[PDB]
Amino acid sequence: MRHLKSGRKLNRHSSHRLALYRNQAKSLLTHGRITTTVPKAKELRGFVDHLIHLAKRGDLHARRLVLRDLQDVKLVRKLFDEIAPRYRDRQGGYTRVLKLAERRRGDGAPLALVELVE
């Protein structure tokens, strides 16, 4: 059973799944759009959003928090200084996931892209 449980396991233990979510956040805040598997993508959404929405808050605490997942001071800075601001008046929903048409070759994995909004 699984009745009413939010979150995937993505065939990773606890420690790894977190890592996974971070070094995607990092890749996505860096490049603004990445491609993964559709499920990992779907989960990336919320993870990033919160960090984005925190940068939006802008305060020191907010940085230090965001910095716990992202680690990179330069990055956080591009997050706060260049990223947060385009969403001042956006109320949640700072990411979008769009499904790609082709499956990967080696394993036939369904791919999607995740990107930051405008």
Partner 1 sequence: AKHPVPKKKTSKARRDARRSHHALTPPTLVPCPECKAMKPPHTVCPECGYYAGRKVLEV
Partner RNA sequence: UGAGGGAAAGGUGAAAAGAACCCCGGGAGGGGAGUGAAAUAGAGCCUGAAACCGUGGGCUUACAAGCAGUCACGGCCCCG
Partner RNA sequence: GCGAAUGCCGGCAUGAGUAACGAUAAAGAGGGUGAGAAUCCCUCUCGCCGUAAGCCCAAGGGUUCCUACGCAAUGGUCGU
Partner RNA sequence: UGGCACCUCGAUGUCGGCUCGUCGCAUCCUGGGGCUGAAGAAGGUCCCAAGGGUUGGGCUGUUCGCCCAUUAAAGCGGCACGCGAGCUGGGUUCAGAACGUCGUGAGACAGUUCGGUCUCUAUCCGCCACGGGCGCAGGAGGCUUGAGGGGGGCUCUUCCUAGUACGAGAGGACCGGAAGGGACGCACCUCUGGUUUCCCAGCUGUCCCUCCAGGGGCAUAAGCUGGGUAGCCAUGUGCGGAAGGGAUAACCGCUGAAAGCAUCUAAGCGGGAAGCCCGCCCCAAGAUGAGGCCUCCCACGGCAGCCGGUAAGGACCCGGGAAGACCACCCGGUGGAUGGGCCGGGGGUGUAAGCGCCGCGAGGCGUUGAGCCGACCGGUCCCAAUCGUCCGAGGUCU
**What does the block give as tokens for 21?**
């979510």
Does residue 7 belong to the site contacting Mg ion (CB under 5 A)?
yes
Does residue 98 belong to the site contacting partner 1 (CB under 8 A)?
yes
Does residue 80 belong to the site contacting RNA (CB under 7 A)?
no
CB of 91 to RNA, least distance (A): 4
Do 55 and 80 touch, CB atoms closer than 8 A?
yes
Does residue 102 belong to the site contacting partner 1 (CB under 8 A)?
yes
Does residue 86 belong to the site contacting RNA (CB under 7 A)?
no
Question: Which residues, 6 or more positions from 113, have their beta carbon under 8 angstroms from its beta carbon?
Answer: 33, 34, 35, 41, 97, 98, 100
Instruction: Pick what 86 binds: Mg ion, partner 1, RNA, none; C-beta below 5 to 8 Å, kind-dependent.
Output: none
